[PDB]
Write a protein that binds this ligand. Structure first.
Ligand SMILES: [Zn+2]
Ligand SMILES: [Zn+2]
Ligand SMILES: [Zn+2]
Ligand SMILES: [Zn+2]
Lengths: 264, 53, 283
C-alpha cells in the first residue's frame, strides 16, 4: 500500500560511550569508548582552578601522563610555560611589545586549536580556551591586541564550553560541569519581625532591619537557608541539619512534622 | 601516535625573523648556532650571511 | 564488552533505544507492548510492561531528563501515546490520534527550545505537540507535506532563536523547514538526489564548527552526506559513501559526529569514519 516495509535490524549510539544494536536470528550493549576523542577518566581527574593556573597545568600534565596521552603532556607543559605572571601586559603601548604579538603566543594557540578542531576533540579545546582567559583610538587597538584569544571569535570559544558541559552532564559529573561553565563570558517573601511586611531580601526596607531570624540560633541569617513551606520557620542550613537529624517537630514548638511538608 | 613529525617547523622560522627584524640579530644567531641542523635548511642562504656579518 | 539481554517477546523487534544516562532501555515490538528494562551491571530486570496501542509499535524516543521521565511511542494504530513515571510507576498520560494513516516517526526537539515532539505520519503531514503547561498540549499541523507521506524527521542543533527541522518522505525529496516570526512554518528549501525512497534522515550534532552535516538513506541503497559550510549561502553539496545491495534502514551519528553507523536490509551493521583525504572508510 503506502506504509513501508517493517524494520528488522538497527543500531544507535546511546549514552556517551555505548552502542545499542539488534539483528534478526536479542539486544546487546557494547562499550564503544576506544573509538572517541573524548575520555571519561580525564574528565574525572581534570582540575580547573581560577587562582593558581601554574598548578592546574602541572596537575593536568600528570593526569595526562597517567592515561597515556603523549601528545597532551607536551601541550600542557607549553601552556605552563606560556602563562606565567611574568608575561603580564602593560597598560602603555609604547613601553613594550606585548607577549600576544610574539609568534609563540596567539599564532601557536591558533596552530593547536585548528589541529584539534580537525581531530574533533571538544575536551581539549574547551579546557584550553578556559586556561587562556585572564589619540584614544590607539589605546583601544592596544587593548584588543594584548589578548591571546581573538576578541572577534568569542562565540566559538563559548560553544566549545557549552558542548563540553552537556557531555559532562551526560557522564554524571555535575560539579565539574559548573566549574567549566563558570568561564563563559555571557551571563546565563520573608516576613519582617519589626513591621510585619513582605520583604524580598535579607534586609527590610521600611524599618531597614533584618527580616530573617534563625529558629535555633537567633542570629540574623544573611546567607543560605531552608524552611518549611507551611510552618514558615527556618534558619541556618547546618542548624536545621543537626536539629532534624534526630527529631521530627518544628523547633519553635509549632507542631508540624516539617520533614513531611518541606520534602515533597 | 604523536604530534606530526614537524608540527612547529613553521614557527621557529617566524620567531627568528621576528627577532631579526627589530634589529636583535644576537638572539637569532645564537639560536641558529645552538639548534644546529633542525632549522638549518629552512632559511635562505643569503639571510644567514647577512645576520652573521 | 557485551551486556546480552533476552527480550522475552512474542514477535519481531522494530526499535530499541537507551536513556540519556546509560541506565534504562526501551524496546518496541510486534506484540503491541513496550517493555522497559533496567540495564545496570548486566541486569535484565523489568520495571514496566506497558500495554495498549492496538497495532504493532514501531518507534520510541526518550525525553531530556531535565523534564522528568517521559517516553513517546508511536504505532500503526495511528496513535501517539506518552508515558510518565509518577511515584515510581509508569502510566499512560496522554494520547493523540490526529492522523488518518499510520504515524511512522517521532523525534524530540532540542531542550533549549522547550518540550516539542515532532511526529510525521504516512498521511503527508507533520504534527507538532507543544507542552503548554498544567497538563496541556497544543497541536499545530502542517497539511500537504509530502506527495505520498513523510517517513522520518530530525531536528537541527540550536544556534544563536531560529527553530528548524528536516523531514523526508515518499516523494524522494528531502525538505527543510523554518518557523516564521508569526508562527508560520514556512518551507525554505528542498533537495533532490535520491532515486527510490528515503527512509531515515539524521542531522549531525554541533560542537561549534561552522559546518552542518546531514546523512540520508535510500531504498535502493545510498548514503549521501550533505555537507554545507557556506555560512549563510544555504547551499548543499551531495556526496556518496557506497551503493549497497538492499534497503538502507537507519543511520546514526556519534556524540562528536565522527563515526556513522548504518544498518539496512542486509541484516548487518556497518561503521564508518571520514579519512584525511575526504573519503569514507569502514572499520
Ligand atoms: Zn521591617
Ligand atoms: Zn543559627
Ligand atoms: Zn512551626
Ligand atoms: Zn512544618
Amino acid at each position: 500500500a503506502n506504509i513501508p516495509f517493517p524494520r528488522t535490524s538497527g543500531a544507535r549510539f546511546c549514552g556517551a560511550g555505548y552502542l545499542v544494536y539488534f539483528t534478526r536470528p536479542k539486544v546487546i550493549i557494547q562499550d564503544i569508548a576506544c573509538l572517541l576523542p573524548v575520555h571519561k577518566s580525564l574528565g574525572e581527574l581534570y582540575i580547573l582552578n581560577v587562582n593558581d593556573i601554574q598548578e592546574t597545568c602541572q596537575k593536568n600534565a600528570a593526569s595526562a601522563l597517567l592515561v597515556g596521552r603523549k601528545d597532551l603532556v607536551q601541550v600542557w607543559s607549553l601552556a605552563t610555560v606560556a602563562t606565567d605572571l611574568c608575561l603580564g601586559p602593560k597598560s602603555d603601548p609604547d613601553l613594550e611589545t606585548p607577549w600576544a604579538r610574539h609568534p609563540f603566543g596567539r599564532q601557536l594557540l591558533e596552530s593547536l586549536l585548528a589541529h584539534y578542531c580537525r581531530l574533533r576533540d571538544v575536551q581539549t579545546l574547551a579546557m584550553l580556551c578556559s586556561v587562556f582567559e585572564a589619540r584614544e583610538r590607539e589605546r583601544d587597538q592596544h587593548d584588543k591586541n594584548k589578548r591571546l584569544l581573538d576578541p572577534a571569535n568569542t562565540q566559538q570559544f563559548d560553544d566549545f564550553k557549552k558542548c563540553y558541559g552537556e557531555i559532562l552532564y551526560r557522564w554524571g559529573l555535575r560539579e565539574k560541569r559548573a566549574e567549566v561553565l563558570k568561564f563563559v563570558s555571557c551571563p546565563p517573601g520573608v516576613y519582617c519581625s519589626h513591621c510585619r511586611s513582605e520583604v524580598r531580601g535579607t534586609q527590610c526596607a521600611i524599618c531597614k532591619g533584618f527580616t530573617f531570624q534563625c529558629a535555633i540560633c537567633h542570629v540574623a541569617v544573611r546567607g543560605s537557608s531552608n524552611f518549611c513551606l507551611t510552618c514558615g520557620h527556618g534558619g541556618h542550613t547546618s542548624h536545621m541539619m543537626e536539629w532534624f537529624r534526630t527529631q521530627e517537630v518544628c523547633p519553635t514548638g509549632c507542631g508540624c512534622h516539617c520533614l513531611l511538608e518541606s520534602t515533597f | 601516535s604523536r604530534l606530526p613529525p614537524d608540527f612547529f617547523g613553521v614557527l621557529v622560522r617566524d620567531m627568528l625573523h621576528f627577532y631579526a627584524e627589530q634589529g636583535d640579530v644576537q638572539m637569532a644567531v645564537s639560536v641558529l648556532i645552538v639548534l644546529g641542523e633542525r632549522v638549518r635548511k629552512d632559511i635562505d642562504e643569503q639571510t644567514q650571511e647577512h645576520w652573521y656579518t | 564488552v557485551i551486556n546480552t539481554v533476552d527480550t522475552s517477546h512474542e514477535d519481531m523487534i522494530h526499535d530499541a533505544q537507551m536513556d540519556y544516562y546509560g541506565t534504562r532501555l526501551a524496546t518496541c515490538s510486534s506484540d503491541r507492548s513496550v517493555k522497559i528494562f533496567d540495564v545496570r551491571n548486566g541486569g535484565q530486570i523489568l520495571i514496566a510492561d506497558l500495554r495498549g496501542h492496538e497495532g504493532p509499535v514501531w518507534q520510541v524516543a526518550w525525553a531530556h531528563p531535565m523534564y522528568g521521565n517521559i517516553l513517546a511511542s508511536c504505532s500503526y494504530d495511528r496513535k501517539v501515546i506518552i508515558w510518565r513515571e509518577e511515584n515510581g510507576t509508569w502510566e499512560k498520560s496522554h494520547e493523540h490520534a490526529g492522523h488518518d494513516s499510520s504515524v511512522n516517526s517521532v523525534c524530540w526537539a532540542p531542550h533549549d527550545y522547550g518540550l516539542i515532539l515532532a511526529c510525521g505520519s504516512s498521511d503527508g503531514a507533520i504534527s507538532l505537540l507543544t507542552y503548554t503547561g498544567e497538563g496541556q498540549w497544543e497541536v499545530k499541523k502542517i497539511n500537504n507535506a509530502h506527495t505520498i507521506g513523510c517517513n522520518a524527521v530530525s531536528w537541527a542543533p540550536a544556534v544563536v532563536y531560529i527553530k528548524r527541522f528536516a523531514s523526508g518522505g515518499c516523494d524522494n525529496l528531502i525538505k527543510l523547514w523554518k518557523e516564521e516570526e508569526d508562527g508560520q512554518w514556512k518551507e525554505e528549501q528542498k533537495l533532490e538526489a535520491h532515486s527510490d525512497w528515503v527512509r531515515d534522515v539524521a542531522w549531525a550534532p554541533s560542537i561549534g564548527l561552522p559546518t552542518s552535516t546531514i546523512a540520508s538513506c535510500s531504498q535502493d541503497g545510498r548514503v549521501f552526506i550533505w555537507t554545507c559550510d557556506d555560512a549563510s549561502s544555504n547551499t548543499w553539496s551531495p556526496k556518496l559513501l557506497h551503493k549497497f545491495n538492499d534497503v538502507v534502514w537507519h543511520v546514526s551519528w556519534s556524540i562528536t559526529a565522527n563515526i556513522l553507523a548504518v544498518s539496512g536490509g542486509d541484516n548487518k551493521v556497518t561503521l564508518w569514519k571520514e579519512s584525511v583525504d575526504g573519503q569514507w572508510v569502514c572499520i
